């Protein structure tokens, strides 16, 4: 099996890629075959600050976040703010399951120190402002999952695909 790295969804140009190398292997997690971005995960209580973002947490179920999993390098090989976590993959709050999933993992979620001595101030709002939709695929798809997304039968709805799904949570701080 391959070790993975869940890439999240920002709002600004800063926290889109945050990783320097690509697949390495060949077997992956997320698929967008023709109609929908399949196999996307959700994690409860984890903001990513959408600027200076390293997965700051939240302490309730109502908070969550969603983004696709890629089996890429652990974010330019830093040994500071990871989790060194893995589990039989029967414990993933994934959306749009498709097919038998591998029953292992090795994920290093870049979850840093929480935002100390500040209240939640967390904002539930989905992704909007299509200029932000084009902002993300500008740098996260045309080379990471670019086997598709350039000449597929339907690419312009993959932008539509993130319209429905992603509704992150940020601390507004």
């Amino acid at each position: 099996s391959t070790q993975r790295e869940y890439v999240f969804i920002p709002i600004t140009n800063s926290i889109t890629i945050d990783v320097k190398i690509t697949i390495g292997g060949s077997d992956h997690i997320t698929n967008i075959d023709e109609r929908g971005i399949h196999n996307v995960l959700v994690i409860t209580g984890y903001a990513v600050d959408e600027k200076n973002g390293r997965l700051v947490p939240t302490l309730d179920p109502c908070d969550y976040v969603k983004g696709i999993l890629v089996a890429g390098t652990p974010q330019q090989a830093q040994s500071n703010d990871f989790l060194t976590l893995k589990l039989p993959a029967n414990k993933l709050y994934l959306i749009r399951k498709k097919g038998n999933i591998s029953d292992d993992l090795k994920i290093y979620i870049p979850y840093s120190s929480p935002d100390a001595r500040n209240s939640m101030k967390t904002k539930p709002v989905s992704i909007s402002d299509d200029t932000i939709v084009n902002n993300i695929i500008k740098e996260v798809f045309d080379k990471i999952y670019n086997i598709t997304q350039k000449e597929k039968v339907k690419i312009e709805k993959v932008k539509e695909d993130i319209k429905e799904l992603f509704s992150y949570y940020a601390l507004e701080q």
Binding site: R35, G36, P61, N90, K91, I95, R96, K97, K98, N100, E164
Partner: protein
């Protein structure tokens, strides 16, 4: 008449009551403007608003017994008997609760967050098509509520033994009575039953025959009840509950696919269904049919007395308008399946095996007219007299549904006295006396050559033996040429005779997507259904008993691939998957992709004769163990479930009281009351319990006779002043009616059955079905049918013991790690913070036949229904009941291996669960066999352990001092142990069980430890 007033009932009480009532947030009722009806009215913004008349009031009363239990006027009062703690109590037990503190829409900011989801799902249905608005909302109501992760709340904080979602569906089902009685009154409790299911399943050479014949039972019944789904929407089906069917949801999607709908709303609703109705298995989307034949078997409707054909509903013409309608709606499905099979077979007129099916579907038209399944329908009725005084409910009306369902059950058991096999309807006298029987193939040297699957009907397609097939296929009419032979042989074995009915089983076994004709029903024309089947190349391969007997071998050469690979290179073992075929078997699908080609017929391989020694040598060099020819046919069935639907107490005290005892409940008055008094007091916790605690006090030995008010008036009247709103609460009558309620409960010795009691048991029975399917997939098994309480699977002999262990406990709600998207929490299946009750008390017996893969599947299935269903009926063991030692008879898990029989009780405690600590010892003898079996194959204990027990047995039997027996088994273990550090204990509550059996051709050792030894010999006998 346009009634459609059930949506007013399905939302009359929002899934936020317990937080809105006796408020927690109390501001989402502020931030829009009776208190809980306001938040109930606000969410009704799609269409017609709530009617404060005969649309909820009377229906909500007869829906559940929470108007009798906790009083009629204090139910509708939300006042004085308050309790500001939202517990959720199980319905079968009451000593088990969850706690439901706060997950719910608290503000309109969060409240409308889901109303936009409700609307964005029904915004796609044209507003003229209200029947799709109800059908869709019916299934997705609690689904979109579970996705938006909200805790499930009880229908009443006082008596928390009813989930609000179930009580909502309950009052909507009773709504068909209330409505049709407000009009010219008539209301029916229709019920359908299938005569001889097991005998229909047991007719098949292969498992694809077993699987198809087990799928016809579900399809033919689904094609009937889908007519009621189309006429009066859902909620007219009490059993099986629709709110979790895999058959309904599948039919529901193809309705949206029909008539056009938003492609990302039919999809928006398809991740809901895949996540919850199924468990993350979109295999049905690729299969295009629901993978598992869920057999309801016993369907009970609650119909209104209103019939269509007036272009809209009218008064029903005659009472027989419903029985005749089903009987003809049932034979239509058989005709419409013979139609599609005829059409499809001519579409593929070439390709072989279909030019044969064409030749018989035409030669035997008259025979195939008759359905091979022969259901039986019954019906009762109600009138305005039995339910109303003038226009309001009458006293004692609350028991009408219970009594009406009583007559329905009796009428079934009354008719089950005469068993009419479906073969009797056929006309075969002149077809056998004179040689007019069409015999495509060989000519019977001796008459007509009975079928090899049935055994009863004569055969139409006789098959030559393996002298040689080609020169005997092509000359005879069977084969037109030679190329079709290898295509006929692929579906019919040489020597196999087939009757018209069984060939239809084989034909549908070659193309299971044809079942869509019955699955959808009156949605697509038969030709449109067939077209999509010839417009594709789906290849659905179904396992056989030789495939199941090769799991550990396949799974061994699948991880020694490269090594086992070079030597053959040509034997289709290292062939590469050349197609993308699929299967309902979630083990074939699960691998299929390790260059191993799981499609190879093992009977041309290690299970062959020209190739046996070869693959013995092949397996020899690679340390691969030669496979055993034995599989395990596991058949589960719950105990006294239908007897539980009558509200009886036999599922609780299985064996201590039997179904026969209810002919005179006074003979068991001491026990039936000890339980019923316990169920009532524990249910309905809060300030109310001490009130009812005193009402059951003043009964016991033919007590006060309404002269108990004195003790309980003080309870109520000193409580009614806690709020100045008492309208006309005649407390001297209120406490009387409550005393009248519990009286009938204790006199009848059984819970008074209401719709909510049924809908809850029914829905839980459908959720337990979900977890039961993950377990049969987890243990590499093959589900043959699993509908509700029943189950039929084919496991390997290896995973059979631990399957029973997990399956038995998962049925009781207790369990380890989640299976799909649902966990098992001590008698409460939980789906994303939503707690749902299970059936912890209901016993569940098992029947394991370890059979050779070559044994005739007719007599293996027959034994499984005549090893348990008449052997489980006679087995008694010494159960621990309230400090005493009584004799229970249920929940036994029988094992059988060609003469050897074993019985392993799963409870040893007669009220199987009375506290949350009762779960961890259900099936506690199984892991005793599992641990023992584990220590043997590791050489830590010799297999001679099973052979020496005989001499230690007489001492362990005669010894009644447990400190002495815990040394005799410690000695018997260590003597024939192969090491010096094996410390294997026996739970010590297993010393003395004395399983007996009344004059039967089944010899069971009369002690538990001996049965543990026989169970191992049976498990080990089926591995060599």
């Amino acid at each position: 008449e346009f009634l459609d007033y059930k949506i007013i009932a399905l939302l009359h009480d929002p899934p936020n009551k317990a937080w809105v009532i006796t408020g927690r947030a109390r501001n989402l009722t502020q931030q829009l403007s009776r208190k809980h009806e306001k938040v109930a009215k606000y969410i009704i913004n799609q269409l017609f608003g709530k009617n404060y008349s005969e649309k909820v009031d009377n229906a909500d009363k007869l829906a559940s017994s929470i108007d009798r239990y906790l009083g009629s006027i204090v139910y509708k009062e939300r006042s004085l008997f308050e309790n500001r703690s939202i517990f959720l109590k199980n319905i079968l037990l009451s000593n088990i609760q969850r706690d439901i503190g706060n997950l719910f829409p608290k503000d309109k900011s969060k409240l409308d967050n889901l109303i936009l989801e409700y609307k964005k799902l029904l915004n796609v249905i044209n507003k003229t098509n209200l029947i799709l608005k109800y059908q869709l909302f019916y299934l997705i109501y609690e689904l979109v509520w579970i996705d938006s992760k909200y805790e499930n709340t009880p229908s009443d904080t006082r008596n928390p033994t009813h989930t609000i979602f179930d009580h909502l569906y309950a009052t909507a089902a009773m709504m068909n009575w209330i409505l049709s009685l407000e009009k010219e009154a008539k209301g029916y409790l229709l019920g359908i039953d299938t005569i001889g299911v097991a005998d229909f399943i047991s007719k098949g050479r292969k498992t694809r025959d077993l699987w198809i014949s087990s799928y016809l039972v579900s399809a033919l019944l689904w094609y009937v009840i889908t007519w009621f789904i189309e006429e009066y929407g859902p909620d007219v089906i009490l059993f099986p509950s629709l709110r979790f069917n895999q058959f309904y949801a599948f039919y529901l999607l193809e309705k949206l696919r029909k008539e056009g709908v938003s492609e990302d709303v039919i999809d928006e609703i398809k991740e809901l269904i895949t996540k919850y109705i199924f468990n993350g298995d979109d295999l049905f989307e690729n299969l295009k049919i629901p993978p598992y034949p869920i057999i309801p078997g016993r369907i009970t409707l609650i119909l209104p007395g209103l019939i269509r054909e007036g272009e809209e509903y009218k008064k029903v013409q005659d009472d027989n308008c419903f029985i005749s309608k089903v009987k003809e709606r049932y034979n239509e499905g058989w005709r419409k399946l013979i139609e599609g099979l005829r059409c499809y077979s001519e579409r593929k007129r070439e390709d072989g095996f279909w030019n044969l099916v064409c030749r018989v579907l035409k030669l035997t038209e008259d025979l195939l007219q008759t359905t091979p399944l022969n259901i039986r329908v019954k019906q009762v009725s109600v009138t305005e007299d039995e339910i109303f005084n003038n226009n309001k409910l009458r006293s004692d009306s609350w028991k009408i549904y219970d009594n009406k369902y009583r007559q329905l059950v009796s009428e079934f058991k009354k008719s089950k006295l005469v068993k009419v096999t479906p073969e009797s309807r056929l006309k075969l006298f002149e077809l056998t006396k004179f040689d007019k029987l069409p015999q495509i193939g060989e000519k019977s040297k001796r008459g007509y050559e009975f079928c090899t699957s049935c055994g009863v009907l004569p055969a139409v397609v006789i098959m030559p033996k393996e002298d040689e097939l080609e020169k005997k296929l092509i000359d005879l009419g069977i084969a037109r040429d030679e190329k079709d032979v290898r295509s006929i042989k692929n579906m019919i074995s040489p020597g196999e005779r087939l009757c018209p009915w069984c060939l239809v089983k084989r034909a549908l076994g070659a193309e299971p997507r044809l079942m869509r004709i019955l699955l959808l029903g009156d949605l697509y024309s038969v030709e449109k259904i067939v077209n999509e089947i010839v417009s594709r190349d789906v290849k659905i391969e179904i396992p056989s008993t030789s495939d199941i007997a090769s799991i550990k071998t396949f799974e061994e050469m699948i991880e020694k691939k490269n090594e086992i690979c070079e030597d053959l290179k040509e034997e289709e073992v290292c062939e590469k998957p050349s197609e993308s075929v699929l299967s309902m078997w979630q083990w074939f699908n699960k691998n299929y992709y390790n260059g191993i080609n799981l499609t190879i017929d093992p009977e041309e391989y290690w299970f062959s004769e020209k190739r046996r020694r070869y693959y013995f040598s092949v397996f020899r060099r690679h340390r691969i163990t030669f496979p055993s020819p034995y599989y395990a046919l596991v058949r589960a069935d719950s105990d006294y479930l239908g007897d539980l639907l009558e509200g009886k107490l036999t599922p609780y005290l299985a064996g201590i009281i039997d179904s026969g005892d209810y002919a005179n409940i006074s003979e068991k008055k001491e026990e039936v009351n000890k339980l019923l008094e316990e169920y009532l007091v524990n249910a309905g916790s809060g300030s109310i319990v001490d009130y009812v605690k005193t009402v059951l006090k003043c009964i016991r030995e033919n007590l006060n006779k309404c002269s108990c008010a004195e003790k309980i008036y003080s309870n109520e009247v000193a409580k009614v002043m806690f709020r100045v709103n008492v309208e006309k609460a005649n407390v001297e009558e209120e406490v009387k009616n409550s005393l009248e309620y519990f009286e009938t409960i204790l006199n009848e010795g059984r819970i008074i059955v209401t719709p909510a009691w049924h809908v809850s048991i029914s829905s839980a029975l459908n959720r337990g079905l979900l977890v039961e399917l993950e377990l049969v997939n987890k243990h590499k098994g093959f589900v043959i049918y699993a509908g509700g309480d029943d189950l039929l699977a084919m496991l390997p002999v290896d995973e059979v013991l631990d399957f029973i262990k997990e399956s038995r406990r998962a049925f009781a709600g207790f369990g380890t790690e989640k299976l799909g998207n649902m966990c098992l929490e001590n008698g409460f299946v939980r789906i994303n913070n939503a707690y749902y009750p299970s059936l912890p008390i209901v016993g569940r017996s098992y029947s394991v036949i370890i059979a050779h893969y070559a044994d005739p599947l007719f007599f293996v299935i027959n034994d499984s229904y005549n090893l348990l269903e008449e052997g489980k009926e006679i087995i008694r063991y010494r159960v621990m009941y309230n400090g005493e030692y009584k004799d229970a008879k249920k929940d036994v898990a029988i094992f059988r291996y060609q003469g050897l029989t074993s019985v392993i009780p799963l409870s040893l405690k007669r009220p199987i669960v009375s506290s949350v600590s009762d779960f961890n010892e259900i099936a506690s003898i199984i892991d005793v066999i599992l641990e023992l079996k584990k220590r043997i194959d590791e050489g830590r204990i010799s297999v001679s352990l099973l052979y020496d027990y005989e001499k230690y047995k007489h001492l362990i039997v005669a010894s009644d001092e447990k400190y002495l027996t815990e040394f005799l088994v410690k000695d018997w273990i260590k003597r024939n142990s192969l090491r010096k550090h094996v410390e294997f204990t026996i739970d010590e509550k297993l010393y003395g069980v004395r399983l007996t059996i009344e004059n039967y051709p089944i010899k069971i050792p009369n002690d538990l430890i001996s049965n543990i030894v026989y169970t191992l010999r049976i498990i080990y006998g089926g591995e060599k």
